[PDB]
């Protein structure tokens, strides 16, 4: 998809999440993998899950990294 749209969906979905300040979505936005809005949606959802599974109310970079790896094959 278009690069700006990819960013928009990420920022739109996470706008309603508690991300630690150091997280930078551009890290995933900037990747070559051709993912879909659904994948982006899954990545964010898994990330929240991973944060909760650690009794953490703030989402971390490690969460998005696993989630990304988990959704893209």
């Amino acid at each position: 998809m278009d690069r700006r749209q990819k960013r928009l969906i990420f920022s739109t979905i996470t706008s309603k999440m508690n991300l630690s300040e150091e997280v930078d979505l551009e890290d995933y936005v900037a990747r070559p993998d051709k993912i879909s809005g659904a994948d982006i949606n899954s990545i964010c959802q898994e990330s929240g899950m991973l944060a909760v599974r650690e009794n953490r109310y703030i989402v971390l970079a490690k969460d998005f990294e696993k989630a990304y790896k988990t959704v893209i094959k």
Binding site: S20, E21, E22, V23, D24, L60, A61, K62, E65
Partner: peptide, 16 residues
Amino acid sequence: KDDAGWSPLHIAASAG
């Protein structure tokens, strides 16, 4: 670095 490879400097820098 934490388990994500982030050092205190990475965090501080990204968090402004």
